[PDB]
Structures are given as structure tokens and as C-alpha cells.
RNA sequence: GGCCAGGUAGCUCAGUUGGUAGAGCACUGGACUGAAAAUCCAGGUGUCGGCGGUUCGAUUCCGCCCCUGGCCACCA
């Protein structure tokens, strides 16, 4: 219908950017971005009115948003900056070549890939490539993005792009950029499954030292990150129904040896989940004594006592220890499995004494 | 879209080591009246958002959604 409405209005609309990339990468997404030559707002309004759905105009931005089923559609007028702008002009202002392509929805040429800068080739050769030298200078946030992309798609930075990147951070543009954009970029990054690789690019190009204050790289933290990777693998393998957000753990490991002030400040800027702040504040002090307690553990019931109150995160942190690993595993796939029949429980009930008694019975079963 | 709170009666508001819920004004009922109100006795003041899960047991622990408000990024 889009090419039809566009036909009627004498306009040209195209699918654009990341979406196109994801399409070419065989990834399906519910968020599609259109670029219209001519008024995009009217296109969106007509579309929404024909499908009979609510529409959300933004006349100052020149863009509109509408949802059809699970599809999320964003229409945007072609512009030359961040006279009518040509498609080519709207594409030239984007970050990397793999993000620089477009696909016509117009009825006559429909299905035709439009590639000006050779984004198809770079996608073909697995290349993260900036459109112009000045790129990272314009938007320093791209610095992270490139890395992020290179991590997820497992692409490589072109020599041009790499040189310009190193030069971009060397000029300290990372500190000058808006804190919010950067922080959000990182928040995106940690949600990747390949986020570890991204951290590797982060360490390689030394961007973390600029954004975080007091952060430095060493071997212990790195090995901790890999051990965390393995633990995450196993946990997300057998216990996968119990999954939580893993990237925050890697973040915690990164900020572990940091001062608590800059740590709480960082988690504050990062708007981390409550369980993340809890796990961090618990890790900063109590964790040592907890480990020392788990070392003194003999009976299984004491282990149950020191463990069960804690969240999954803390346990995943305890799996870092070689000595504690089999113990925590034993706690997970074994130590908690149990129930009690009717008559017995009825006799157990014959206040808090019911709970205490049940605990006495459980510790009677364990040891 | 991420996060933070706030979610408690009809309205306005507190409540942590999980263990049997509260205030101020409206609600019914009766004593009171010619009727009404005040006031007295009292006692409804409630699946403490919705739904699952862990637990003997969840307002609480966790997960997914609902609403409102505020900080935030809002194309790539």
C-alpha cells in the first residue's frame, strides 16, 4: 500500500538504514524506517488512516510514527543536515556504509536496492567503513558505535576508519561528546550477546579510560571477564529459564576495582537496574566475608542459609571461584529440590514457629 | 524506548529482619428524633496494581505486563 499511496502523492519512499542492513543480514525486525522525498507526514497520515490506526505526528522533526500490527513504522522526510533533499543527500549523512543503503517501495522499481557508497560490498567484505574522514569528529559517539557494530556482526574496521578512530580518541573527543549519548551507547552495547568482543574493541582502542573516570585495564579483570563468559554460558545453558541480564555482570567486573564513589556515580549515570546496584554494593564489601564463610561451610544447610537469600547475580559472581564452583552448582541443580506430603505437613502444623520447625526439618533432611 | 519513584479504603497518606494490617472525613445498621443532623456504641473501611513463578506461606524475593509523573536518550 505504501508504494500505492506514494504513487498517488507523486512521492518516493524508501526503506532506509539499519533495517536494510538487517534485511540483508537475514535478520527480521519489527521496526522499519522510511525516507520520503516530499512530505513524509502526509504519507504517514494517509497510511495510518487507510489501515485505520492511530498516528503520531512530529511536524518540527518532519517525521511521524505509526504502528501496524507488530510492525513499528517511522516515516521521515529526506534532509541534508542533522530546498528539498535528495535520497542520496539523506544517505550521505549517515555513519557507516552498511548503514548507508536504501530499498525502494515505489511500485515500479519495487525491490531494488539503492547503494551509492558501496555499502553492499562492505557488507559483503565485512567492513565497518566511515563515509568521510571527518566522520568521528562530527559525532564522537560513532566511535563506540563502530566498535559495537564490529563486535556484533564480527566485522572489521577499514584501515581508513581505524586510523580516523584512533585519531578521534587521541584528540580527546570522547570527553567532549554529550555524556548522555555516550552512556546510552554503552547501555546499548552491554545488551549485545557479543558484548564481550565489543569490550575487547573497547580495550583495544582504549575508549573506556576516557568515558569512565579512574578506569584502567589489567589482566585479572580480563580473565575475570572470560570466566564470567564461561559461567554465563553454562548458566544460560542448563538454567536458561532463570536467565537475567548478563551484560551488567561484565560491567560490574569492569567497575569492581574502581572506587565506590565513581562506581555509584557511574551506575547512577547508567540508570542500572535495582538488582545491579544491590549486587554491586553487596560485592563491594560483604562479598569477601561471604566467600570466607562459604570456605568454612561444612553442612549443606549452612550453604543453603548463606546462599538462598541472595539473588542469581551474586551466585553467578560466586561461581568465579574455582573452589566454590562445584558447591554453587550443587546448590543449584540439587540442594534446592524438595517438597513434603499432606499428612506430614499437617502434623508439622500440628506463628514463626511453623517456619522455624520447617527449617529444622529441612536441615534434618539435608545433613 | 531505558531508568527512577510513586500504586494502601470513596478522597488525601505511613507501613522491611516473609508470620494473621492502620489515620482523618463519606458506608450500612441501631440507640437518639415529629423528621433531619450532630453525637455514642460500634463495626464494611481492603483479593495493599495485574498475572505467573520461588517459598509451608509473597504487599515483600524475582519475571512479564497495566497506569501516572519525572529524569533521559529520541534518525542512524
Last residue of a domain, one of A93, A124, A155: A124
- Bases on strand B under 7 Å from any protein CB: 2-5, 18-20, 54-57, 61-63, 71-76
> Does residue A246 sit in the same domain as residue A178?
yes
> Does residue A307 sit in the same domain as residue A234?
yes
Residues around strand B, C-beta < 7 Å: A 17-18, 21, 31, 33, 58, 61, 74, 76, 82, 93-95, 99, 139, 141-142, 178-181, 184, 187, 244, 271-275, 278, 311, 336, 338-340, 345, 351-352, 354-355, 358, 362
> Does residue A81 sit in the same domain as residue A145?
no
* Cα distances (angstroms) measured from residue A199 to each of A132, A178, A228, A250, A303: 25, 21, 13, 9, 34
Is residue A217 classed exposed, middle or buried when 0-12, 13-18 and 19+ CB atoms within 10 A define those classes?
middle
> Does residue A253 sit in the same domain as residue A215?
yes
> Which of A68, A42, A47, A39 shows the shortest CA–CA distance to A4?
A47
| CATH number for the domain that contains residue A120 | 3.30.460.10
Nucleotide nearest to A79 (CA to C1'): B75
Q: What is the CA radius of gyration of chain A?
A: 27
The DSSP element (H or E) to which A314 belongs, if any, is: helix A312-318
Nucleotide nearest to A33 (CA to C1'): B75
> Does residue A88 sit in the same domain as residue A150?
no
Last residue of a domain, one of A89, A124, A159: A124
* Alpha carbon distance A240, A248 (integer Å): 17
> Does residue A134 sit in the same domain as residue A25?
no
Q: For residues A142-161, b (16+ Cβ closer than 10 Å) or e, as one string?
A: bbbbbbbbbbbbebebbeeb
Give the three-class secondary structure for A248: helix
The DSSP element (H or E) to which A32 belongs, if any, is: strand A31-37
A26-CA/B7-C1' distance, Å: 43
* Alpha carbon distance A193, A209 (integer Å): 23
Q: At what angle do helices A142-152 and A159-170 cross, to 10 degrees?
A: 140
Last residue of a domain, one of A124, A158, A182: A124
What domain range includes position A328? 125-367
| Number of domains chain A contains | 2
> Does residue A205 sit in the same domain as residue A57?
no
Q: For residues A45-71, b (16+ Cβ closer than 10 Å) or e, as one string?
A: bbbbeeeeeebebeeeebbbbbeeeee
| CATH number for the domain that contains residue A144 | 1.10.3090.10
A144 in a known ligand binding site: yes
A105 in a known ligand binding site: no
* Cα distances (angstroms) measured from residue A142 to each of A38, A146, A168, A186: 29, 6, 10, 11
A1-CA/B26-C1' distance, Å: 57
A121 in a known ligand binding site: no
> Does residue A153 sit in the same domain as residue A247?
yes
A354-CA/B18-C1' distance, Å: 13
> Does residue A89 sit in the same domain as residue A144?
no
A152 in a known ligand binding site: yes
Cell of A273: 537496574
> Does residue A23 sit in the same domain as residue A57?
yes
Residue A228: CA atoms inside 13 Å, Cβ hemisphere, count? 21
Residue A97 contacts by C-beta under 8 Å, 6 or more apart in sequence? A117, A118, A119, A121, A122, A123, A127, A129, A131
> Does residue A226 sit in the same domain as residue A320?
yes
Nucleotide nearest to A191 (CA to C1'): B2
The approach used to solve this structure was: X-ray
> Does residue A143 sit in the same domain as residue A70?
no
A244-CA/B52-C1' distance, Å: 17
Amino acid at each position: 500500500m505504501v508504494g500505492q499511496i506514494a504513487k498517488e502523492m507523486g512521492l518516493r519512499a524508501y526503506i532506509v538504514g539499519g533495517v536494510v542492513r538487517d534485511i540483508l543480514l537475514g535478520k527480521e525486525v519489527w521496526d522499519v524506517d522510511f525516507v520520503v522525498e516530499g512530505n513524509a507526514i502526509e504519507l504517514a497520515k494517509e497510511l495510518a488512516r487507510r489501515h485505520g490506526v492511530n498516528v503520531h505526528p512530529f511536524p518540527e522533526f518532519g517525521t511521524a510514527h505509526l504502528k501496524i500490527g507488530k510492525l513499528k513504522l517511522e516515516f521521515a522526510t529526506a534532509r541534508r543536515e542533522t530546498e528539498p533533499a535528495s535520497l542520496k543527500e539523506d544517505l550521505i549523512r549517515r555513519d557507516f556504509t552498511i548503514n548507508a543503503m536504501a530499498i525502494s517501495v515505489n511500485l515500479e522499481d519495487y525491490g531494488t536496492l539503492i547503494d551509492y557508497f558501496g555499502g553492499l560490498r562492505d557488507l559483503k567484505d565485512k567492513v565497518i567503513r566511515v563515509l568521510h574522514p571527518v566522520s568521528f569528529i562530527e559525532d564522537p559517539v560513532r566511535i563506540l558505535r563502530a566498535l559495537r557494530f564490529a563486535g556484533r556482526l564480527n566485522f572489521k574496521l577499514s584501515r581508513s576508519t581505524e586510523k580516523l578512530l584512533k585519531q578521534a580518541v587521541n584528540l580527546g573527543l570522547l570527553k567532549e561528546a554529550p555524556r548522555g549519548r555516550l552512556i546510552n551507547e554503552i547501555k546499548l552495547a552491554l545488551r549485545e550477546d557479543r558484548f564481550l568482543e565489543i569490550l575487547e574493541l573497547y580495550r583495544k582502542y582504549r575508549v573506556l579510560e576516557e568515558i569512565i573516570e579512574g578506569f584502567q585495564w589489567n589482566e585479572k579483570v580480563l580473565q575475570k571477564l572470560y570466566a564470567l563468559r564461561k559461567v554465563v554460558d553454562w548458566h544460560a545453558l542448563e538454567f536458561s529459564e532463570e536467565r537475567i541480564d548478563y551484560g551488567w555482570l561484565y560491567l560490574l567486573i569492569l567497575i569492581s576495582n574502581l572506587d565506590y564513589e565513581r562506581g555509584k556515580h557511574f551506575l547512577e549515570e547508567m540508570s542500572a537496574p535495582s538488582w545491579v546496584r544491590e549486587t554491586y554494593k553487596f560485592m563491594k564489601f560483604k562479598l569477601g566475608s561471604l566467600k570466607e564463610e562459604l570456605k568454612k561451610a561444612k553442612e549443606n544447610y549452612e550453604v543453603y542459609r548463606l546462599l538462598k537469600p541472595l539473588h542469581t547475580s551474586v551466585l553467578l559472581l560466586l561461581m568465579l571461584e574455582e573452589e566454590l564452583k562445584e558447591k554453587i552448582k550443587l546448590y543449584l541443580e540439587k540442594l534446592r529440590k524438595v517438597k513434603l506430603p499432606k499428612e506430614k505437613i499437617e502434623e508439622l502444623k500440628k506463628g514463626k514457629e511453623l517456619g522455624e520447625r520447617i527449617e529444622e526439618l529441612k536441615r534434618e533432611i539435608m545433613n
